[PDB]
Amino acid sequence: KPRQKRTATKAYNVTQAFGRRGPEQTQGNFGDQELIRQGTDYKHWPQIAQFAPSASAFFGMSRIGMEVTPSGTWLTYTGAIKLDDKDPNFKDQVILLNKHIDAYKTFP
Amino acid sequence: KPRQKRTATKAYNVTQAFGRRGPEQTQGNFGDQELIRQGTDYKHWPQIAQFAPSASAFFGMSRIGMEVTPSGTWLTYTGAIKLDDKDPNFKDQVILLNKHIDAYKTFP
Ligand SMILES: CC1(C)S[C@@H]2[C@H](NC(=O)[C@H](N)c3ccccc3)C(=O)N2[C@H]1C(=O)O
């Protein structure tokens, strides 16, 4: 199964599917120990998943590039998704996301 | 519907759902005039969607950020998806992506 279509679970976790969290430019940086171990089996996965784009919105919203390099041909992307700072749930949404962003720094 | 969960189609097209294509960091750059007007109705949409990330992959592969600002809050994302050059339609995939990346610059 191609990487971008994979689904992390406890049986095939975030490290297994998507590699060690870390600081380098195309290394993923999201997930505390719990989410890394659990993937989509994490009990608050739906709270995170609400921010993930549809395929339509991924190619609609993103800045897309294509790079040909010694490692192969890559589809590059950047973008931003705006939260609803008016939502009463907003504060708890930020905390949850901040909890996973760069969490790897605090453990081996 | 939240922007990231929208699905463009001929009845609700890329521009209506995700704004004009353009050079700005908040705009998208992807799609020629056929893709913009048809969205997921686009004849080659399946061949573009194959490179769009699953919710697990979006959070597993991407460099994720949170910009909490007095004027609004955004989940940031960047990354790279390698193409499969062993795929029989690799060359067609490269030609397809080339037709849409930044196509807006030519529009009459
Ligand atoms: C003449 C071609 C452009 S169509 C044919 C096929 N490539 C395809 O696009 C394929 N059948 C197809 C997939 C999806 C939608 C529509 C068509 C192939 O190979 N050919 C090209 C060529 O080499 O010149």
From Swiss-Prot, chains A, B:
Motif: Nuclear localization signal; annotated at: 1-8
Its localization reads: Virion; Host cytoplasm; Secreted; Host extracellular space
Q: How is it modified after translation?
A: ADP-ribosylated. The ADP-ribosylation is retained in the virion during infection. Phosphorylated on serine residues by host GSK3A and GSK3B. This promotes the solubility of homodimers that would otherwise aggregate. Host phosphatase would dephosphorylate the protein during assembly at M bound membranes.
Please verify whether the record's keywords include Repeat: no
User: Which Gene Ontology cellular-component terms appear in the entry?
Assistant: cytoplasm; extracellular region; host cell endoplasmic reticulum-Golgi intermediate compartment; host cell Golgi apparatus; host cell perinuclear region of cytoplasm; host extracellular space; intracellular membraneless organelle; MHC class I protein complex
One GO term under biological process is:
response to host immune response
Keyword Lipid metabolism assigned? no
Q: Name one GO molecular function term.
A: MHC class I protein binding
What superkingdom does the record give? Viruses
Q: Keywords of this protein's UniProt record, alphabetized?
A: Acetylation, ADP-ribosylation, Host cytoplasm, Phosphoprotein, Ribonucleoprotein, RNA-binding, Secreted, Transcription, Transcription regulation, Viral nucleoprotein, Virion
In this chain, the stretch annotated as Dimerization covers: 2-105
Positions of the region Putative NLRP3 binding?
Answer: 4-84
Q: Which residues form the CoV N CTD domain?
A: 1-108
**Quaternary structure (record):** Homodimer, homotetramer, homooligomer with RNA. Both monomeric and oligomeric forms interact with RNA. Interacts with protein M. Interacts with protein E. Interacts with NSP3; this interaction serves to tether the genome to the newly translated replicase-transcriptase complex at a very early stage of infection. Interacts with host NLRP3 and ABHD8; these interactions disrupt the association between NLRP3 and ABHD8, increasing NLRP3 stability, ultimately leading to increased inflammasome activation.
User: What does the protein in this record do?
Assistant: Packages the positive strand viral genome RNA into a helical ribonucleocapsid (RNP) and plays a fundamental role during virion assembly through its interactions with the viral genome and membrane protein M. Plays an important role in enhancing the efficiency of subgenomic viral RNA transcription as well as viral replication. Attenuates the stress granules formation by reducing host G3BP1 access to host mRNAs under stress conditions. May block host chemokine function in vivo, facilitating viral replication and transmission. Acts by being secreted into the extracellular space where it competes to host chemokines for binding to host glycosaminoglycans (GAG).
Task: Give the family, as the similarity comment puts it.
Answer: Belongs to the betacoronavirus nucleocapsid protein family.
**What name is this protein filed under?**
Nucleoprotein
Organism from which the protein derives: Severe acute respiratory syndrome coronavirus 2 (2019-nCoV)
Traced from the root, the source organism's taxonomic lineage reads: Viruses, Riboviria, Orthornavirae, Pisuviricota, Pisoniviricetes
Q: Which gene encodes it?
A: N
